[PDB]
């Protein structure tokens, strides 16, 4: 149970940083697209409304 978990928790934590910095990337990556999907569905609003 722990003989391999102590490696599967360890080599996972080898990536808890290098993947973790990219984990701050893909979070704010699509997050700003929530304004791009708002200002799209807001650019879906202003087109025919005027």
Partner 1 sequence: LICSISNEVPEHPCVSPVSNHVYERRLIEKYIAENGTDPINNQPLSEEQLIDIKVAHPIRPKPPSATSIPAILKALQDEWDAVMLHSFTLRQQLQTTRQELSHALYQHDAACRVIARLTKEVTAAREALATL
Partner 2 sequence: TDIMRNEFERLAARQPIELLSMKRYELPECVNNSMAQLEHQAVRIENLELMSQHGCNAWKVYNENLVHMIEHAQKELQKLRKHIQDLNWQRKN
Residues that bind partner 2 (CB under 8 A): 1, 3-5, 7-8, 11-12, 14-15, 18-19, 22, 25-26, 29, 33, 36-37, 39-40, 43, 46-47, 50
- Chain residues binding partner 1 by CB under 8 A are 8, 12-13, 15-16, 19, 26, 29-30, 33, 37, 40-41, 44-45, 48-50
**Cα three-residue angle 43-45-50, rounded to 5 degrees:** 105
Q: What is the dihedral of CA 44, 47, 49, 50, to 10 degrees?
A: 160
Distance CA 35, CA 43 (A): 11
Picked from partner 2, partner 1, none, the partner binding residue 3 (CB below 5 to 8 A depending on kind) is: partner 2
């Amino acid at each position: 149970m722990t003989t391999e978990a102590k490696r599967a928790a360890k080599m996972e934590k080898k990536m808890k940083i290098l993947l973790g910095g990219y984990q701050s990337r893909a979070m704010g990556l699509m997050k700003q697209l929530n304004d791009l999907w708002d200002q799209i569905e807001q650019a879906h609003l202003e087109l025919r409304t005027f």
